[PDB]
Amino acid sequence: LSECKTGNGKNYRGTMSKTKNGITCQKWSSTSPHRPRFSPATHPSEGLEENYCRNPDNDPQGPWCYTTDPEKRYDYCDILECEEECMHCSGENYDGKISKTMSGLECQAWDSQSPHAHGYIPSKFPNKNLKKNYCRNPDRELRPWCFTTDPNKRWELCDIPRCTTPPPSSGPTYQCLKGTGENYRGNVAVTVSGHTCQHWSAQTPHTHERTPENFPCKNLDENYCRNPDGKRAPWCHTTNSQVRWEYCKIPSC
């Protein structure tokens, strides 16, 4: 079933099996390390299968599970809230029904190889929500898109409404380098070889698509080094007409 939830998740039937703190859930049909007050024998219509997170008691805090930690009887799980009316960030979790592209073309179905042959086969990418002919962003495009039914346009981006509420929490950000700097939010604006960063909102001296508009949840503010895509460390386009982009040297945390 659908791996996202709505409201307090009373009807959630996804397969999340870790608590919000990373502890593996205990099976509902198991009595160690804790004795469940909810299990299939007594609550057969609550979906208490395997060790998936559920809300058998209508908890306002949403889905939870008994945990395999003897010291923690149960805990709430971290589950993707469904994005149907609008999308957040660049729509990697968009799960709505819009099926027309920018120019108004009807989307080709993901399970169809006609008129365009492709590799986004739903059963090969089962967790990508490649349903019917709905616009999706399975792997790093600017926003949700689809192959089109027009033989003369292989694919095109779709016009998906952006949610105005706050985005999903993505964990903590740092003013120092941790890992590949995906969580960096400091103010360094110079590269390793000493170049001045070009503002992300500007298209000179270099044209690009890594703009605050396309990537709202990446905080591509002013000309601060950022690692909005999947690079080794933070980087930025430079105001040097001869160096399109370069990595920045951010002090580790």
Are β-strands 245-247 and 235-237 bridged in parallel, bridged antiparallel, or unpaired?
antiparallel
Q: Which domain holds residue 200?
A: 171-253
210 is in an annotated binding site: no
Sign of CA dihedral 174, 176, 179, 184: positive
Rounded to whole angstroms, the Cα distance separating 137 from 129 reads 10
37 is in an annotated binding site: yes
Question: 15 near 63, Cβ under 8 Å?
Answer: no
User: Do 115 and 157 fall into the same domain?
Assistant: yes
What Cα–Cα distance (Å) separates residue 62 from each residue in 59, 76, 142, 149? Answer: 6, 7, 32, 40
Which of 82, 108, 136 is at the close of a domain? 82
Tracing tokens 């105001």 back to the chain, one arrives at 239
140 is in an annotated binding site: no
Which of 82, 114, 140 is at the close of a domain? 82
CATH of the domain at 186: 2.40.20.10
Which of 119, 141, 170 is at the close of a domain? 170
User: Do 120 and 139 fall into the same domain?
Assistant: yes
User: Do 22 and 39 fall into the same domain?
Assistant: yes
Closest CA relative to residue 100, chosen from 122, 138, 132, 133:
133
User: Do 197 and 216 fall into the same domain?
Assistant: yes
User: Do 1 and 17 fall into the same domain?
Assistant: yes
Q: DSSP for 82-106, please give it.
A: PB-SSB-TTSTTB-----B-TT-PB
Rounded to whole angstroms, the Cα distance separating 184 from 181 reads 5
What Cα–Cα distance (Å) separates residue 83 from each residue in 17, 50, 103, 121, 157? Answer: 21, 26, 23, 22, 18
User: Do 71 and 32 fall into the same domain?
Assistant: yes
What Cα–Cα distance (Å) separates residue 251 from each residue in 80, 85, 185, 234? Answer: 32, 40, 12, 11
Q: Is 218 helix (H, G, I), strand (E, B) or coil?
A: helix
Could you give the number of structural domains in the chain?
3
Question: 197 near 225, Cβ under 8 Å?
Answer: yes
User: Do 201 and 150 fall into the same domain?
Assistant: no
User: Do 176 and 161 fall into the same domain?
Assistant: no
How was this structure determined? It was done by X-ray
User: Do 200 and 154 fall into the same domain?
Assistant: no
Dihedral angle, C-alpha 95, 99, 101, 104, nearest 10 °: -150
User: Do 60 and 115 fall into the same domain?
Assistant: no
Strand partners, 237: 245
User: Do 50 and 89 fall into the same domain?
Assistant: no
User: Do 161 and 206 fall into the same domain?
Assistant: no
